Every structure is written in structure tokens, then in C-alpha cells.
């Protein structure tokens, strides 16, 4: 609790500054501190939390993929180079897992349980699915299955709520469906499920665009284009 002495509002202010400065590790630390104040988060604050951690873990994931590729090449008439590639991949991996565990911990203590509105609850459950998905990307042990199931379960709970409580064009509903489709294709070895989910999501959103303002239209169509990009890649 290094942020325990800082006002909630000052933490949020500094998170916004950190975002402007592209200091995402600081941003994440400020937002962790804000969460640990124990109050629920507004929509803007939820997005600050998400942006911060997604940028941190995104950098870690990219680094992990670089190192994993080098390691795989080392294991092909490749000359023995000793333990260093594996050691350093493991270092990065452990740090990535630590960040995922930190986010999951915030969600479990106590963001999800206090989230009663569909917008908040879906947002947090989507986050939960995403960070388990990131853990699944690097998992190989006796627990890859359990990690995959944890991701699936979170995504599924989010989906069920989103379908009941949000319009098909809601950006969080769309983003959830996008990420769950990625889970199906990339993690769960279920490309047909991925394709179906992306197609159904896109089509139901298309049919609801007429209800939207110009600005909401822009928000929804941005994510719809991502669904389309994946469908184009996958088919």
C-alpha cells in the first residue's frame, strides 16, 4: 500500500497525468491505489484502470513472445547456448504472471462483488476473462486447463449478463464478444466457435445501429470493424 497515504482524487489525477506521459506502470500503480481505497469506480475510472494494466501487460506479452520465439529456435541443429534464454523468458513470464495476479486480485477483492450495475459487472468480468487469457497464453503446466476454464467461466458470466442487460451495440458488450472470440480461436482451440460468435455479434450489432446517435454509432462501429478484421483473418 505505497499509495495508502495519497488521496483518492489525487491518485486519479496522477493516473491521468501518467497516461498523458505514457508512463503506464505509474498509471497502473496509481489506479491500484485508487481501487484499494475501497470505493466503487466510475466508468471513467474503470477505463483508467483497464488502460493502465492493459498497456503494462501488453508490453510484457510482446516481450514474452519475442523471447519464446528465440527459445523455440534454440530447441530445434541449433548450437547450445546454455540456460540464459530460458532463464530470461522465465523472468519476464513471472513478471507478467505477477501483473495478471495483481489485476485478478483487485477484481476479487472487491471490485466484482460490489459491482451490481450491468455496465460495471460486465466490465470487470471481461477484465477477469482477459487476464486469465493472458495467464493461459504462457501456461504449460498441470494448470493450463484450469486457467483456461477460469477465463471461459468469467467470459461466459459476462456474456450472459451483457445479452440480458445491454443492447447489441453497447461497446463493452461488443468488446467482450471480440475478446471471447479471440479466446476461442487462440486459446481454446475452437475456431468455429470464434467465427460463429464474431459473425453473430457483428450482425446483431449491424441491425441495432439505426437506434444510435452519430457519436454512439462511431463507438460501436469501431469495435465492429475489429470483429470484421478477425473474420477476414479467420476465414
Amino acid at each position: 500500500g505505497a499509495m495508502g497515504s495519497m488521496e483518492r482524487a489525487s491518485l486519479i489525477q496522477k493516473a491521468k497525468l501518467a497516461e498523458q506521459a505514457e508512463r503506464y506502470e505509474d498509471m497502473a500503480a496509481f489506479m491500484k491505489g485508487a481501487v484499494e481505497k475501497g470505493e466503487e469506480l466510475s466508468c471513467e475510472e474503470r477505463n483508467l484502470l483497464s488502460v493502465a494494466y492493459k498497456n503494462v501487460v501488453g508490453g510484457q506479452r510482446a516481450a514474452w513472445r519475442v523471447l519464446s520465439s528465440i527459445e523455440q529456435k534454440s530447441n530445434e541443429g541449433s548450437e547450445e547456448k546454455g540456460p540464459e534464454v530460458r532463464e530470461y523468458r522465465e523472468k519476464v513470464e513471472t513478471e507478467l504472471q505477477g501483473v495478471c495476479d495483481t489485476v485478478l486480485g483487485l477484481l476479487d477483492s472487491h471490485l466484482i462483488k460490489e459491482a451490481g450495475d450491468a455496465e460495471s459487472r460486465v466490465f470487470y468480468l471481461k477484465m477477469k476473462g482477459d487476464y486469465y487469457r493472458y495467464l493461459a497464453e504462457v501456461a504449460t503446466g498441470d494448470d493450463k486447463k484450469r486457467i483456461i476454464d477460469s477465463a471461459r467461466s468469467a467470459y461466459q458470466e459476462a456474456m450472459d449478463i451483457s445479452k440480458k442487460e445491454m443492447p447489441p451495440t453497447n461497446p463493452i458488450r461488443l468488446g467482450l464478444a471480440l475478446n471471447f472470440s479471440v479466446f476461442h480461436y487462440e486459446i481454446a482451440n475452437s475456431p468455429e466457435e470464434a467465427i460463429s460468435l464474431a459473425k453473430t455479434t457483428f450482425d446483431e450489432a449491424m441491425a441495432d445501429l439505426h437506434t444510435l446517435s452519430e457519436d454512439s454509432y462511431k463507438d460501436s462501429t469501431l469495435i465492429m470493424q475489429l470483429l470484421r478484421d478477425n473474420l477476414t483473418l479467420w476465414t
Binding site: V51, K54, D130, I223, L226, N230, L233
Partner: peptide
């Protein structure tokens, strides 16, 4: 080529 997930903004 990797699938696209949600943007971070």
C-alpha cells in the same frame, strides 16, 4: 498473424 482484441484507449 495474431487475432485482434479490444483496443486500449
Amino acid at each position: 498473424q495474431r487475432s485482434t482484441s479490444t483496443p486500449n484507449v
